[PDB]
Amino acid sequence: FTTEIHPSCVTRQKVIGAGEFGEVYKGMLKKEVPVAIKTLKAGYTEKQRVDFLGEAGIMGQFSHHNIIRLEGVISKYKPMMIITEYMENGALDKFLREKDGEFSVLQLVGMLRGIAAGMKYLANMNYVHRDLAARNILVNSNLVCKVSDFGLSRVLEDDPEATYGKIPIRWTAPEAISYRKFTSASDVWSFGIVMWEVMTYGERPYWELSNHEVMKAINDGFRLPTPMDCPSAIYQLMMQCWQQERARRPKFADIVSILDKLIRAPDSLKTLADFDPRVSIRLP
């Protein structure tokens, strides 16, 4: 099963995430290695226990460079804990917003290739994420991006971006919004939004539009416009992730292949899609 870790091997050092029913800590695991530690406070319900240990059970079934690695669990003692590798740079959305403009286009596309490789693995393993977004991607000190936030009902219930069907509207495919059809192809829609998040350094999708306004625009055929300084091939790819007809979207294998070829011939990324300015600056 999973590795059972003795509480004496774990030292919690600093809170990096918090909720009403536990916290996420940076800590050390016994040379000691840095880890992330998530706890479940006393009084937890049966459903909370199944959801909590269920995330660890899912993560322990995976072994991939771009999927967060499980070190082990504390289940024989209280409080219960899940221990994973520690991703030094935190969540991808916050990371990009705090490092605006600091990366090369090739670095940004390499991030997307890693996310896509992780998603290809998950999809082939018959795991549908349902909440793919930059906020659920973690970044380490090698700039490697890893998919996180696993489970069944707990994923969308725990995400504040998911609003009441409780769903994060501006990341979610139309069929998942409309009739709750969550598949790897709705994950591909979300991946397209993640591509846009990365290339904009974490801009909020659709900006200030309301959730109802987003669904209306999508149904009317509108799509997010090109980011600034965005390779034409990258904008083309995210546009095809946003096809209304699920069956026409690329599969993650297609996405990984295209991204791998663009990175291997990096001059291909120098051709930029046109950017629509919202403001004209005239000078005589």
Ligand SMILES: Cc1nc(N)nc(NC(=O)c2cccc(Nc3ncc(C(=O)Nc4c(C)cccc4Cl)s3)c2)n1
């Ligand atoms: C600049 C600066 N300073 C400090 N002190 N610390 C940081 N890093 C962070 O704040 C930070 C923020 C969010 C996430 C992380 N790294 C994480 N790595 C793994 C995490 C994690 O949640 N793992 C996990 C997952 C994904 C599922 C179940 C259980 C666990 Cl334990 S969180 C670090 N950055």
